[PDB]
């Protein structure tokens, strides 16, 4: 083993450490080798009223240093008049604690949509 | 090492286990520390005929317990009259075995689109 | 330990190796057990002029063998007249070095959009 400590042992045999996770609907996974954190979350919104709608989403845990990337998509909660695919999204701002997602619609009927976000950071 | 078993050895030096994967177009990666599984897949559809279209997608492998998150996006297979970016998607339902993705179009010309999904679960 | 080499030691106790990463805005993470690489990137574009727009994006690093999956989404850089959610995207082609993303708009006002891509490969 060439050492008397766990850290020294792993370094000498080139081993990594276990990842950790919260395996929840709004959850996260952390690589404890590099510190990278991946998170995923969702929020149910309801109908899109038209125009431009901003919504703040809070990550399951805060990134300790930075959020590097977000991946926003649309979920359908129900189909009252038309499908949630008539709503589209883009990210407005990204922070260590959450993001702002903007949505708009291209069909003016009632939806029941939600927003999903996957995020990468550390 | 402080133990006579591989599991006990790793616990004593704080080491994790190797991830496994199928590095395929429709593939998966599994963290065998936490059990988290990430999958990715695609299906070629063709033209969007208008209206609302639901399609069932089957994951490369079933999640043993639950799918936590899906990330659906649109791929362009070809460009017969207009681009596949005129088709948009949302997820309708998510299970341990697959998902239903709904699509609609905002330009009524011929596309050749497909659906991509990335999924997280365990 | 049952061996005199680091690789043999890890095999005998069933330990994996540390992942590596570039924790940058345009960055990557590599599982050195399976070789899977995840990358993320963004590019600011500006206004969508209408019609169909193709753009080539270059991955932070080349995948040594193949890109298996891409996840393109839209970011809002600013809001000059309307939101970037009125622009939508699809992937046209994917290679070991990058991808081509096609975009179109469903509202003919000025945007300031960018393109985000998450990619999986090895
Ligand atoms: Mg509506
Ligand atoms: Mg069509
Ligand atoms: Mg414009």
Author numbering:
A (entry chain A), B (entry chain A), C (entry chain A): 580 to 701
Paper text:
Unlike T-even myophages, P2-like myophages and P2-like tailocin tail fibers consist of a single, large, trimeric tail fiber. Specifically, it is known that R1-subtype pyocins require the presence of common Pseudomonad outer core L-rhamnose to adsorb, whereas R2-subtype and R5-subtype pyocins require inferior outer core α or β-glucoses. From this alignment, we concluded that R pyocin tail fibers are composed of two regions (numbering relative to native PA0620): a phage proximal region of high conservation (M1-A425) and a distal region of lower conservation (A426-R691).
We were unable to produce soluble yields with a corresponding construct of R1-subtype tail fiber from P. aeruginosa, LESB58. Of constructs tested, only one produced a soluble yield sufficient for crystallization trials (R1-NTF; 16.18 kDa). In R1-NTF structures, only the complete foot (V596-Y701) and partial shaft (L580-G595) domains are present. Similarly, the R1-type tail fiber foot domain has an analogous charged groove located ~9 Å away from the charged cavity of R2-subtype tail fibers. It also binds a small divalent cation that is coordinated to R1-NTF residues E684, H627, D626, Q690, L688, and two waters. Although glycerol is abundant in R1-NTF and R2-NTF protein preparations, only the R1-NTF structure contains a high occupancy glycerol at a site formed by residues T635-F638 (β8) and S672-I680 (β10, L4, and β11), and located ~25 Å away from the distal loop network. Our structures also reveal a unique glycerol binding site available in R1-subtype, but not R2-subtype pyocin tail fibers, that putatively indicates the involvement of nearby residues in R1-subtype specific LPS interactions.
